[PDB]
Design a protein around this ligand. Structure first.
Ligand SMILES: O=P(O)(O)O[C@H]1[C@H](OP(=O)(O)O)[C@H](OP(=O)(O)O)[C@@H](O)[C@H](OP(=O)(O)O)[C@H]1OP(=O)(O)O
Length: 99
């Protein structure tokens, strides 16, 4: 879990139970492929981490610039980028890491 950082930046993430959206900082690493997320300063312990090998990442039509990751074991993460370019860049990086 300590490798080179492939991409980082903030995204809004939906919580599972109450469905609110919160800004978190995300960091994608390889070997193994994982997406960790943090408090938006990136200063504290990670909040969580998503194992990406074999995941499905999909752009979701409209909340704007939505996309979803479903891990290989069927855990869903619903995310929103601040711009269409950032959704396109995150999907391409997760799809390449997921191989
Ligand atoms: O750990 P805290 O209390 O800050 O909670 C997160 C969300 O809980 P709430 O934001 O209090 O509703 C949470 O959403 P819901 O099920 O929407 O209540 C979300 O599932 C949970 O996600 P992870 O633990 O990362 O899976 C908590 O959100 P994060 O702080 O982004 O971790």
């Amino acid at each position: 879990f300590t490798g080179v950082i492939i991409k980082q930046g903030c995204l809004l993430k939906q919580g599972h139970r109450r469905k609110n959206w919160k800004v978190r900082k995300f960091i994608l690493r390889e070997d193994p492929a994982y997406l960790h997320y943090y408090d938006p300063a990136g200063a504290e312990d990670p909040l969580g981490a998503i194992h990406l090998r074999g995941c499905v990442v999909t752009s979701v039509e409209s909340e704007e610039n939505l996309f979803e990751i479903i891990t290989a074991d069927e855990v869903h993460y619903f995310l929103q980028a601040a711009t269409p370019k950032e959704r396109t860049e995150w999907i391409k990086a997760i799809q390449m890491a997921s191989r």
